[PDB]
Amino acid sequence: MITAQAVLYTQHGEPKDVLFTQSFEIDDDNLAPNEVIVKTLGSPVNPSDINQIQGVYPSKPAKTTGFGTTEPAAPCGNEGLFEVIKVGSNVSSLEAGDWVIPSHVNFGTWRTHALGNDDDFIKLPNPAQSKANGKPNGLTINQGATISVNPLTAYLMLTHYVKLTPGKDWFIQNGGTSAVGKYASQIGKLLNFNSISVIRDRPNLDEVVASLKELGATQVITEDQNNSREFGPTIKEWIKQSGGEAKLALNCVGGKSSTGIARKLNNNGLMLTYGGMSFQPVTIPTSLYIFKNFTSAGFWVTELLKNNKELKTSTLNQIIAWYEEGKLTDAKSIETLYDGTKPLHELYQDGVANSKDGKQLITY
Amino acid sequence: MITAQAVLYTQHGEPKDVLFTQSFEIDDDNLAPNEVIVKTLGSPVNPSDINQIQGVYPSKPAKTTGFGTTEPAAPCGNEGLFEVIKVGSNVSSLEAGDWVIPSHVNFGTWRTHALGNDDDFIKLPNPAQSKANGKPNGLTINQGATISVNPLTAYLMLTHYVKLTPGKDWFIQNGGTSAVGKYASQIGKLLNFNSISVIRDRPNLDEVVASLKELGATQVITEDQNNSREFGPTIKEWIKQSGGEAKLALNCVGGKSSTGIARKLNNNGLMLTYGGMSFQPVTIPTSLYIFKNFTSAGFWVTELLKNNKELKTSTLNQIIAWYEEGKLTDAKSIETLYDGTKPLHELYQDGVANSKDGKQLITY
Amino acid sequence: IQNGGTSAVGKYASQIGKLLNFNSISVIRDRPNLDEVVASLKELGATQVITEDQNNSKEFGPTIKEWIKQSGGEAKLALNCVGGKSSTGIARKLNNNGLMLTYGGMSFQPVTIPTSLYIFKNFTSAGFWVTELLKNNKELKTSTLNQIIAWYEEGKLTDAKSIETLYDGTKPLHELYQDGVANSKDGKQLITY
Numbered sequence A, B: 001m002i003t004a005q006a007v008l009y010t011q012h013g014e015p016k017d018v019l020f021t022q023s024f025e026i027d028d029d030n031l032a033p034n035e036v037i038v039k040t041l042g043s044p045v046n047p048s049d050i051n052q053i054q055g056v057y058p059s060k061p062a063k064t065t066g067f068g069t070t071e072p073a074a075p076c077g078n079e080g081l082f083e084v085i086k087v088g089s090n091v092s093s094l095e096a097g098d099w100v101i102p103s104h105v106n107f108g109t110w111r112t113h114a115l116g117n118d119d120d121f122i123k124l125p126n127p128a129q130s131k132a133n134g135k136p137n138g139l140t141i142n143q144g145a146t147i148s149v150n151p152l153t154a155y156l157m158l159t160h161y162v163k164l165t166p167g168k169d170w171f172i173q174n175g176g177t178s179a180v181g182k183y184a185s186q187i188g189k190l191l192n193f194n195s196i197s198v199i200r201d202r203p204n205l206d207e208v209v210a211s212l213k214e215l216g217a218t219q220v221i222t223e224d225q226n227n228s229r230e231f232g233p234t235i236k237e238w239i240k241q242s243g244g245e246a247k248l249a250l251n252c253v254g255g256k257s258s259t260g261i262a263r264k265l266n267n268n269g270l271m272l273t274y275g276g277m278s279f280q281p282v283t284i285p286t287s288l289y290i291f292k293n294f295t296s297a298g299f300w301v302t303e304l305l306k307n308n309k310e311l312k313t314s315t316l317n318q319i320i321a322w323y324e325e326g327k328l329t330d331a332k333s334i335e336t337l338y339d340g341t342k343p344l345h346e347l348y349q350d351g352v353a354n355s356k357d358g359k360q361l362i363t364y
Numbered sequence C: 001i002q003n004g005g006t007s008a009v010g011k012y013a014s015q016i017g018k019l020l021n022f023n024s025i026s027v028i029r030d031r032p033n034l035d036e037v038v039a040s041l042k043e044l045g046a047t048q049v050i051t052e053d054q055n056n057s058k059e060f061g062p063t064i065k066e067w068i069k070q071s072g073g074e075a076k077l078a079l080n081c082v083g084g085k086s087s088t089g090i091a092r093k094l095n096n097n098g099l100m101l102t103y104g105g106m107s108f109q110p111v112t113i114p115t116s117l118y119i120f121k122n123f124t125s126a127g128f129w130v131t132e133l134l135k136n137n138k139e140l141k142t143s144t145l146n147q148i149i150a151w152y153e154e155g156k157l158t159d160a161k162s163i164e165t166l167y168d169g170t171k172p173l174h175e176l177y178q179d180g181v182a183n184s185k186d187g188k189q190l191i192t193y
């Protein structure tokens, strides 16, 4: 028998208040024929995971007593990389040593182990398999553990809604230092799209601007520049020189930031709102709608891919291939290793509290 | 020779500051084969006419010296009703005595007369012609003078964008007592669409609600009710119990009002913004975009119909038909008759200053 | 509680309710002249008038419960002449051990009652047909008439006020009736002689 740990809550609220660790038992002897046991290698903290715990995210796992609690409790985390440790006698899709992610949301990835079927998982090539299949690179644990939400989100927003002419057209995005922002910049570079990333000013501004330009942002501006009527004509010059148009805006901030990036689009522009990193609503001047034919819409990768498994597979395959080819790198995570001395839920609580420092990955 | 008067400006600014009256001559003995002289019967003051004079509306007539001014001058007003007084030899589409409106914007309707081409005008049936054609009603001067902006606006937003299932689906609009609002309620009754009108509270709320329901609003709520957490579920019930969905929001207010109506839509809703209440941007919760697949877009009748004579025709013909059949009613305008004892531009200046009293129609 | 609140019966029930000092809720369809219809029904003795939208509303349910608690009483009886959703809504408003009487049926709609009401609330749903009830019950018929009569012109009950047309030889008798049938929507038609 394996003794596992899961991060659970019995009631919605802030992670600092409601999370605890539950020890539970998994039977790793005498597997059913289709069953698969996996050990976690790592799982990140994404905003969606936190919103799920807070109760403001309408897709969530059921509260159950299945982890051996008396009160119904929900697990946490939708994304993660797991190593297959044992498979049942009718399992050929997976074997010991294989890398997998969950095939569906609401799996509960903030935990040490899981028992499911082979259809609960999607296989990723492990480094040994990538090299054997003649690839110059294999995935890292961070790359595998964060492959499923943010890279697909960036890829689909940039490709699935409006067609940007390679070598000419632009997108503009706020939250430029976000993991999603960093994938968008790289995917923009790979597809030959011009882009403007908007970021908050900070003391190490120059270092950040350089990182983002290296990733693929054509220009990086601050939110102060975004707000600036004086600066607008400079952006117009860039776009005019390119021969192209700013056709797409990606908004994960809301408020004034959403106003600023919308104003920078050419007529007939599209904005996709995929997040709201301050509680501020999407705010658009009436004149953009009426006089510039602006359109504002939403994006939600979970809903988009629900009955679109071909689209999911195709997108994921492209990200894997790019990683194997050395053409894509990961939005880097701050890693915290679980080793048994500090309760698992506290690692995640610290991760939630240190969100501002950057993407957090709990490792195992 | 005809002595005529036109309200002009040589520089953009406030109507109270920049309008003047110019006398000019039209040669009625020298018509080119396709030319037409008309005499104004009436023309309204609309916000867009004012914004045009102000220089903040991106559609405007050219400034020329063609009215006999030293400096280039623009005419004023975009809609109005005229009577044909003479036509050239190749004109078969119009006859002396006919009623017409401008076929395009930027014609200049704040004046006593105009020379144009026959394709500068669109024929409306005069009262005599309507009665001779067997119809129960001829159009009033106010109905013809105001037919081209607000009725077409309401009709097109309701039919041109999302298909509302007759007998089941809903639209919701703010600015419920506006000209467009009241047309939309009537069109909703005529087409069998359910609707919610949002209006400002007033002492005679009982009378206004009854008036709007008679016009065709299914439900009328105040802006306080639109904002109310307590009231929200009552609206969701109206829609749910009907078996239809709230698919379309019409927004002319912005701000909190726009937030409130957006929240009342079902999933996959569409908002059209066609106006704003001064400086109040369109404000939409991020959550509606992400989780409810909301879309917000704009509506500008001027741009929609600019190169779509077919759609303009078809729409106008239906509104004319409804007026002839007594199925559509206009809001009464405050009429000021030009008789030459007071300069024409001052009539329009007073109408601008008195806009809060109600729709201003200058008559001739 | 009753639906078809503007019906002739509805209007008498509101009055008789007031005379007997029974509290009542009349349900009516919404209309542009709601305020005027509501006033007229309350003048006749409806304690409360609601729309069918309100009848449909889970949100509004507790407001009705407050009315009933405040009076130290219970809603024991529902009168249904509409059917469908409307019959569902008025049934739900009864306290435990309620009775619905169905005496009419506006257009196609069956009497539709949640299972839970029958099982958990001891609800009973029955019919009413004045003819059948009074076929062999003249003692009950006359006793009821005696009270209506006494209230009449003790000045305590108001009739529904008919549009009369005299058979005075101006037109044939059947044409008088034919017109009142064609003119049913204006109100109750009485041919006098």
Ligand SMILES: *O([C]1[C]([O])[C]([C]OP([O])(=O)OP(=O)([O-])O[C][C]2O[C]([N+]3=[C][C]=[C]C(C([N])=O)=[C]3)[C]([O])[C]2[O])O[C]1N1[C]=NC2=C1N=[C]N=C2[N])P([O])([O])=O
Residues within 6 Å of the ligand: A046, A047, A048, A149, A150, A153, A175, A176, A177, A178, A179, A180, A181, A199, A200, A252, A253, A257, A273, A274, A275, A276, A277, A278, A299, A300, A301, A302, A355, A356, A358, A359, B290
């Ligand atoms: O500015 C902040 C960061 O740029 C950014 C957050 O970065 P992150 O790496 O921690 O978060 P990500 O995992 O990339 O994604 C965060 C947002 O995107 C939404 N999202 C992601 C994927 C899929 C969906 C979807 N709809 O399919 C949605 C998610 O909900 C998040 O909203 O935020 C910036 N930030 C933080 N506070 C801010 C702000 N910008 C402006 N104003 C305020 N207050 P930094 O680098 O710290 O300065």
